[PDB]
């Protein structure tokens, strides 16, 4: 399920916004050229970066536990 | 379950490694990225990306 | 009437704030170490940078006009 | 009488010349420092400082 640069940038950008990192969000939106990203912001849920990251951890725990 | 500081360091490292100098600078401060208790040594390059990769594999396992 | 680095930094910082340059103000406050400046913000009037700059221009106009 | 864009370019140039990289970057955007109609050539280094210097001489002439 290959992930693109623009995707992670969107997840990060939205994380900065939601966490109240107003100044970082602004700076990152520009540096990452987020305006030029082809992603629909309205279809991205809140805490998305937090959610995937949480699942990423659990997935790795599952890989170790079966071979544990 | 991950914590705010852990997530913050992940995005912070990503920002540095991705060459987002000005974002890295501003976010280091706004986060108070230290003052927090994380050892940079135990977090490898692309860790944010890597954990996200495993997270999409998990989501692809839930719709299956 | 010698002017110091911290002084001009304060004038600029306050200009960014007042003009609504929220993100610049934040970034500059940090870069210029404005927290470490020995200046009393409460005794600095609004549009101070704009005012001095305006007077700076008028002063130069006066220097040219008498020799004009 | 000076204009918003003129003041903005002055502070912008000052930010660059003073090595405030991250401020210069953020302020270039937030200002929309161009999109505005100023020729960099006709504005010398330290122009912000210089005009401020003359402004304090003027204020010192008013209390006198």
UniProtKB/Swiss-Prot annotation, chains A, C:
Result after altering residue 39 to A: Reduced interaction with NCOR2 and GPS2
Entry's free-text remark on domains: The F-box-like domain is related to the F-box domain, and apparently displays the same function as component of ubiquitin E3 ligase complexes.
Subunit structure: Homotetramer; dimer of dimers. Component of the N-Cor repressor complex, at least composed of NCOR1, NCOR2, HDAC3, TBL1X, TBL1R, CORO2A and GPS2. Interacts with GPS2 (when sumoylated); leading to protect GPS2 against degradation by the proteasome. Component of a E3 ubiquitin ligase complex containing UBE2D1, SIAH1, CACYBP/SIP, SKP1, APC and TBL1X. Probably part of other corepressor complexes, that do not contain NCOR1 and NCOR2. Interacts with histones H2B, H3a and H4. Interacts with MECP2; recruits TBL1X to the heterochromatin foci. Interacts with USP44.
Reported impact of residue 26 to A: Abolished homotetramerization, leading to a homodimer
Top-rank taxon: Eukaryota
Ranges for domain LisH: 4-36
Subcellular location: Nucleus
Annotated source species: Homo sapiens
Protein name as annotated: F-box-like/WD repeat-containing protein TBL1X
Associated disease: Hypothyroidism, congenital, non-goitrous, 8: A form of central hypothyroidism, a disorder characterized by sub-optimal thyroid hormone secretion, due to insufficient stimulation by the thyroid stimulating hormone of an otherwise normal thyroid gland. It may be caused by congenital or acquired disorders of the pituitary gland or hypothalamus. CHNG8 is a congenital, X-linked, relatively mild form which may be accompanied by hearing loss in some patients.
Function: F-box-like protein involved in the recruitment of the ubiquitin/19S proteasome complex to nuclear receptor-regulated transcription units. Plays an essential role in transcription activation mediated by nuclear receptors. Probably acts as integral component of corepressor complexes that mediates the recruitment of the 19S proteasome complex, leading to the subsequent proteasomal degradation of transcription repressor complexes, thereby allowing cofactor exchange.
Tissue expr: Ubiquitous.
Protein family: Belongs to the WD repeat EBI family.
Domain F-box-like: 41-68
């Amino acid at each position: 399920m290959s992930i693109t640069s623009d995707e992670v940038n969107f997840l990060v950008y939205r994380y900065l916004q939601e966490s109240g990192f107003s100044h970082s969000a602004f700076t990152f939106g520009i540096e990452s050229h987020i305006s030029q990203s082809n992603i629909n912001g309205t279809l991205v849920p809140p805490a998305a970066l937090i959610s995937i990251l949480q699942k990423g951890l659990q997935y790795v725990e599952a890989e170790i536990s079966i071979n544990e």
